[PDB]
């Protein structure tokens, strides 16, 4: 995990568990509930190939894909649902919902 | 000046500093003046938004909006809150004022 990140996924406090930072580097980060996921989050309404970050550089904007989860990727200001492998462009500190889980991307300086 | 039984928690890194409000029995006035319980001073806030009353200290609060331009959004499950329609808070509830996250927490 010697990867220099360039965003940060953070994850609030809810019944799932405390906060915690996920750090996203360049190119495809995996969102999942599997342990190899670039994004691990071991929840059972996650899926296992839930969405991905693609990150191509850094004076850029991630890309958000939702991979044909079962419970859904949103984005929330404003609401909207991301229909499965359309390409969503993420502003920082951006609020999302995979699942039940509520996440906010955050671009490091 | 109130003992609270609660808190709603502001998140920050480009809408205000974190700051905690003080949620007392009774009915607590979420909006932008500053005489509300929760006074949020962000132009996407209504002057009176939502309301949060707190029964007893035992009983989850409950939160609704007051016909508010930019609405409440909960997420549990997600959705935009009706004027008019009861939520109860759970504690660490997320929900959402216009544009402002927040996070409820009984104290």
Redesign the interface.
């Known amino acids: 995990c010697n990867v220099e990140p360039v965003g940060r996924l953070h994850i609030?406090?809810?019944?799932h568990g405390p906060e915690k930072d996920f750090p996203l580097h360049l190119g495809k980060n995996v969102v999942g509930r599997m342990p190899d996921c670039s994004v691990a989050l071991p929840f059972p309404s996650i899926s296992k190939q839930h969405a991905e970050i693609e990150i191509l550089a850094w004076d850029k904007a991630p890309i958000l894909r939702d991979c044909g989860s079962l419970n859904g990727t949103?984005i929330?200001?404003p609401?909207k649902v991301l229909s499965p492998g359309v390409s969503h462009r993420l502003r920082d500190?951006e609020?999302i919902?995979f699942a039940?889980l509520?996440c906010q991307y955050?671009r490091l300086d």
């Open positions: 609030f406090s809810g019944a949103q929330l200001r609401p500190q609020l919902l039940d509520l955050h």
